[PDB]
């Protein structure tokens, strides 16, 4: 099935956000990213996607449909606003093997704080 995500300049958690920021899906599902405001895109973060999944990067302002195949956790960012915290976590299948690794990886402090919130309060 399909899960729709919006990219906004301002939302529930503050400025520059993906809503929802926690996406639960299964292999074969699609995630459709819709920039409701301009200036946003979606890009997989290096070493924060599962082992055999392909990297991806959409163009700014375009609607992008991601098909997810490999199970595991994926942290995606908005390229321009990553440093301002704009990320989302996609969890494919149950108990994603790489989730603790992604939570521990090096990333901006603001990113880390939002990630922690979404895993607690968004799961």
């Amino acid at each position: 099935e399909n899960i729709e995500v919006h990219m906004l300049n301002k939302g529930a958690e503050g400025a520059m956000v993906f809503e929802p920021a926690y996406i639960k899906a299964n292999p074969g599902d699609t995630v459709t990213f819709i920039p409701v405001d301009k200036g946003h895109n979606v890009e997989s973060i290096k070493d924060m996607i599962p082992e055999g999944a392909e990297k991806f990067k959409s163009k700014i302002n375009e609607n992008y449909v991601l098909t997810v195949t490999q199970p595991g956790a994926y942290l995606v960012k908005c390229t321009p606003h990553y440093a301002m915290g704009m990320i989302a976590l996609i969890a494919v299948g149950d108990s994603p093997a790489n989730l603790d690794q992604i939570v521990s990886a090096k990333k901006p402090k603001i990113v880390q704080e939002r990630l922690e919130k979404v895993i607690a309060s968004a799961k």
Binding site: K10, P80, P108
Partner: protein, 336 residues
């Protein structure tokens, strides 16, 4: 100059102070070109702006709105080490209008919490200019939050009028004006939050109205009055730099005037003279020099009377000295 030539120039570290005061500096350059070094940590916290306890999540360079005024001469290179502490939650960046290349330094200074960088640019044009953070996609928000100040690159030989005479000031103050946009609830009371991002959507709605709920100087209504009222004595010359990095203002010293005022904030451009009220366009800092001739309390504020008395754009300078009747005298005091 080549990299080798720049590496052999003398470097001078400068300690910045908090507005409206400026750090120590000589009008006339002492020596040739030198790489001036200044460091400012950004602190996003909550500052009260009025007596009603209104609060704005300020993003402040050096912990003060507006950031501190850096002062170097033309030709000297300003090297600024910025640091965004892990305690913050948003990535910033600094774009100095007085620089050339990389969106004013914003394209090479994006640093997220826990990151610091160092950018050095040559000050090739003389004049006050406004610097301000502008992260791609959230520029207006960071500037309105109080993330902007101004630097003054003074001519190697100091300042001079339009004919070439030297104008030297005994005191210089920097008043950064800031127009905020605070969200209110249904009853009209300002709303307060707990984090900076929680007030982003509500703030944008107010910013679109192009109508600031408060326009003040130094980050708060009544900030430069009382214990902060500037000071000057009859016979003293004072240069008052003023900057607005998100709104046009019109400075006016009540009881005095801008003898010489570089409205455009560019020294090469001749300074208007005998000015009652000047005009500085959003995104620009100017400067006015005036020699006080009468003692007493004078208010200095954005003429928009509404913006200066109802919003909060009015400061006050206390001046000491002897009154001069020749200039003004009450022949008949108010009576029946």
């Amino acid at each position: 100059a080549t990299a080798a030539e720049i590496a052999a120039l003398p470097r001078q570290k400068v300690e910045l102070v908090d507005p409206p005061f400026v750090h120590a500096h000589s009008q006339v350059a002492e020596g040739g070109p030198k790489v001036v070094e200044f460091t400012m940590v950004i602190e996003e916290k909550k500052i009260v702006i009025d007596d009603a306890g209104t609060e704005v999540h300020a993003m402040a360079f050096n912990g003060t709105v507006p950031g501190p005024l850096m002062v170097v001469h033309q030709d000297d290179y300003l090297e600024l080490t910025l640091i965004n502490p892990e305690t913050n939650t948003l990535m910033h960046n600094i774009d100095f209008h007085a620089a050339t290349g990389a969106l004013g330094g914003g394209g090479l200074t994006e640093i997220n919490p826990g990151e610091k960088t160092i950018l050095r640019f040559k000050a090739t044009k003389p004049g006050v200019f406004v610097y301000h953070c502008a992260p791609p996609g959230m520029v207006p928000w960071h500037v309105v939050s109080g993330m902007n100040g101004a630097i003054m690159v003074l001519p190697r030989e100091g300042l001079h009028d339009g004919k070439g005479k030297a104008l030297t000031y005994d005191k210089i103050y920097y008043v950064g004006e800031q127009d905020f946009y605070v969200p209110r609830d249904e009853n009209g009371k300002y709303k307060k939050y707990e984090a900076p991002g929680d007030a982003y959507e509500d703030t944008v709605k107010v910013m679109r109205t192009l109508t600031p709920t408060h326009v003040v100087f130094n980050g708060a209504v009544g900030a430069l009055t009382g214990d902060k009222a500037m000071t000057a004595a009859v016979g003293e010359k004072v240069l008052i730099v003023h900057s607005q990095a998100n709104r046009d203002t019109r400075p006016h010293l009540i009881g005095g005037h801008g003898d010489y005022v570089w409205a455009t904030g560019k020294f090469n451009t001749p300074p208007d003279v005998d000015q009652e009220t000047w005009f500085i366009p959003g995104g620009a800092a100017g400067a006015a020099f005036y020699t006080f001739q009468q003692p007493g309390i004078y208010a200095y504020v954005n003429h928009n009377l509404i913006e200066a008395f109802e919003l909060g754009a009015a400061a006050h300078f206390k001046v000491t000295g002897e009154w001069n009747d020749d200039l003004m005298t009450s022949v008949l005091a108010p009576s029946g």
